[PDB]
């Protein structure tokens, strides 16, 4: 019985691979070779945020490209007015060890978490005029690695229990739970329409799930090490991922296979964060060697380097309008380029 | 300046927040950080409770010689350790508890200590080995029912050091077993250390009340070594 089911799974995997190779008719390098080079890009630090005590670990731009939320292991969330280098809000956190932070698109709510195993959601516009604990979501049996907002009443969280949970803030209950992942889930990304989402885990596997149906529609296994970051193409039909193997792989949902690989010999460290610009041609990926690299997504060549750092590039993100990029590091220093 | 009234008010709020952050930094830096790990068979929980008198992180404050100490325990996080251990970088010490009384699973704890020591992230952080459960180990060795020779074939060849100073009122067999365990752990720690980080093993018991003083002394020696490194003396 167990042997029969294992053999059936092996046969289904082989069928998957055969279908992929059947649709693996051509590579992007062959098609993209006729595209003009992006050329050298000179990105220089435009704004420095200094008021943090320890490692910065998470950051997400809201609907606007001005406000910036940052989370620091000193146990603090800081909302900065990026245009004016002003700390809009400072919030101490009950748990010093923080690793994730999410900004609601409307800006009325912020979320974060870490090793406390409970995701904390606060709000900025309380009638009292002060930040308060809006919600304390509990049930994940492992650290919270990432979290994202579908809307003000829905929140998606990924944890180390090999399970991801979509919660309702009104009732504070696990609205939906996915247990299909095998390894620890590290990062989470939201598709434009929000009807689908993609997650990445330490088993060298990325998985696509439906928000409502909640089944693993497709899986991607092209990495050889633990996956640290995930980001979806702006069109929402593709995504990119990076792992400790010192390489980046970009896959397409529609074809259900890998589309392109970005890497070079000199890089010998893991990946921290990956993101795309408004056009999607610029793929910005952080690194553990105190550097960040922006590559040509289509032609897969080194376009620019951001070396303004003293420690890990823990987090990096792009704005909605794509006017600038933010990068937070272990040295408690935030640098914004453009 | 060009800032409008409502911009200068925001700037004033920003400077107030900066001063508050300075105060929080002042409060934060005066304390020393400890990450405490061990197994269920290890006397972790009793050690934590004595120091006092589904959350994935447990915090414990304790003051020794007018010095504040954070103690952080991870109990609910899964067996996997290489991922969530990166968060605990820049911690002054790592207190690893080993059940010296337990012989069956001593090899697994030894392998765990090897893995933590070989960690690339924890390559400049000091480790304090608390070989807990010393009365139980004493009785187990004295009775003779369980022999460490079977589990560790080199214990037969191992000898009691002449330089060793046995504890008062200690039988030779208990001292030999304790020193053999400490010898194995010290041999593992020394390898790959290269002087970057130092290990500080100590014999500790469940009811022993010297844990605070021993931890303070080890975290003072660690600080002295670090300052030697930084102030251009070594």
């Amino acid at each position, epitope marked *: 019985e167990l042997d029969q089911l294992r053999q059936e799974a092996e046969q289904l995997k082989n069928q998957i691979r055969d279908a992929r190779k059947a649709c693996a008719d051509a590579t992007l390098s062959q098609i993209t070779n006729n595209i003009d080079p992006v050329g050298r890009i000179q990105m220089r630090t435009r704004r420095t945020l200094r008021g943090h005590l320890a490692k910065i670990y998470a950051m997400h731009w809201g609907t606007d490209s001005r406000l910036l939320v940052s989370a620091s292991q000193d146990g603090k969330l800081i909302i900065w007015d990026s245009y004016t280098t*002003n700390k809009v809000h400072a919030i101490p956190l009950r748990s010093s060890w923080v690793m994730t932070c999410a900004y609601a698109p409307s800006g009325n709510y912020v979320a974060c978490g870490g090793l406390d195993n409970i995701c904390s959601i606060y709000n900025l516009k309380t009638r009292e005029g002060n930040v308060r604990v809006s919600r304390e979501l509990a049930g994940h049996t492992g650290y919270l690695s990432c979290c994202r907002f579908l809307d003000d009443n829905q929140i998606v969280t990924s944890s180390g229990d090999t399970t991801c949970a979509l919660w309702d803030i009104e009732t504070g209950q696990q609205t939906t739970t996915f247990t299909g992942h095998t390894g620890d889930v590290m990062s989470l990304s939201l598709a434009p329409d929000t009807r689908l989402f993609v997650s990445g885990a330490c088993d060298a596997s990325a998985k696509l799930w439906d928000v409502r149906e909640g089944m693993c529609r497709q899986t991607f296994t092209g990495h050889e090490s633990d996956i640290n970051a995930i980001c979806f193409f702006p069109n929402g039909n593709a995504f990119a991922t990076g792992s400790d193997d010192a390489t980046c792989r970009l896959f397409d949902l529609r074809a259900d296979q890998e589309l392109m690989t970005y890497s070079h010999d000199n890089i010998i460290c893991g990946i921290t964060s990956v993101s795309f610009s408004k056009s999607g041609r610029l793929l910005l990926a952080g690194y553990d060697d105190f550097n960040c690299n922006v590559w040509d997504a289509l032609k897969a060549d080194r376009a620019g380097v951001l070396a303004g750092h003293d420690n890990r590039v823990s987090c990096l993100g792009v704005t909605d309008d794509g006017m600038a990029v933010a990068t937070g590091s272990w040295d408690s220093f935030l640098k914004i380029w453009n | 300046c060009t800032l409008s009234a409502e*911009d200068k008010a*925001a700037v004033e709020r920003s400077k107030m927040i900066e001063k508050q952050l300075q105060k929080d930094k002042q409060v934060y830096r005066r304390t020393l950080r400890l990450l405490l790990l061990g197994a269920d068979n290890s006397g972790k929980s009793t050690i934590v409770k004595q120091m006092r008198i589904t959350s994935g992180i447990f915090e414990t404050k304790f003051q020794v010689d007018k010095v504040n100490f954070h103690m952080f325990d991870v109990g609910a996080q899964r067996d996997e350790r290489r991922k969530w251990i990166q968060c605990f970088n820049d911690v002054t010490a790592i207190i690893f508890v080993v059940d010296s009384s337990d012989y069956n699973r001593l090899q697994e704890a030894l392998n765990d200590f090897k893995s933590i020591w070989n960690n690339r992230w924890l390559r400049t952080i000091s480790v304090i080995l608390f070989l807990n459960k010393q009365d139980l180990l004493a009785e187990k060795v004295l009775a003779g029912k369980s022999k460490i020779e079977d589990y560790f074939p080199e214990f037969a060849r191992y000898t009691t050091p002449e330089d060793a100073t046995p504890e008062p009122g200690e039988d030779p067999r208990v001292t030999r077993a304790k020193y053999f365990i400490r010898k194995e752990f010290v041999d593992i720690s020394t390898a790959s250390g290269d002087g970057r980080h130092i290990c500080y093993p100590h014999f500790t018991c469940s009811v022993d009340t010297e844990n605070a003083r021993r931890i303070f002394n080890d975290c003072k020696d660690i600080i002295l070594q670090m300052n030697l490194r930084e102030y251009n003396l070594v």
Partner: single-chain antibody
Amino acid sequence: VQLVESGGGLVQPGGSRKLSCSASGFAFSSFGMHWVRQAPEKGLEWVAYISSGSGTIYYADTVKGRFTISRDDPKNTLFLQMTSLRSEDTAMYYCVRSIYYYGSSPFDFWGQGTTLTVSGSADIVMTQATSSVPVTPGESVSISCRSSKSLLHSNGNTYLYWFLQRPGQSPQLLIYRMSNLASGVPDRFSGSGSGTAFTLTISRLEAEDVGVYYCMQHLEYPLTFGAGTKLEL
């Protein structure tokens, strides 16, 4: 949210008085406090402003060297000690909380006020052409107010605020920074304009939408108020 003020009463010419405002329900250390005076059957006049943490203190020309303001943060209290009171100072005095940051909404809460009885060069002249325009429920209305200087700043924010003093009540923020609608105010109310000419439109008038409407600037510290435009049932 609760601001209760006391200390208003009968005074003699030349004496001093002390107004105490207690605050409860909201943080007092993170909110700037404004003292505002309105003469009987007259418009609102700004007295003073004190920022958070006793950082910035600003008065008006007519009350310079006579009024003093202070804030007891632990007691969440505001003190206004005013000297050499005269017949020109009789008025209803309100304490107003304000918060300043990107996306903020200052002048959002007003105290009930205290009744005090005793016996322009550089300021922005906040004109209000309309004086008293009767209107009925179910009819859209609009009121325009001007300024001596183009209030638009390099920031892009036009610092124009619209308040409503319903009969026998304290003023209420309706619109901030010329277009942003305050929390809890109906969407009937809408504000628009350009640097030196602004307007407030109430889509479907109602009994609640009756009172004097005031238009204030926020560039110069004087924080001058508009003259007023009453509505009738």
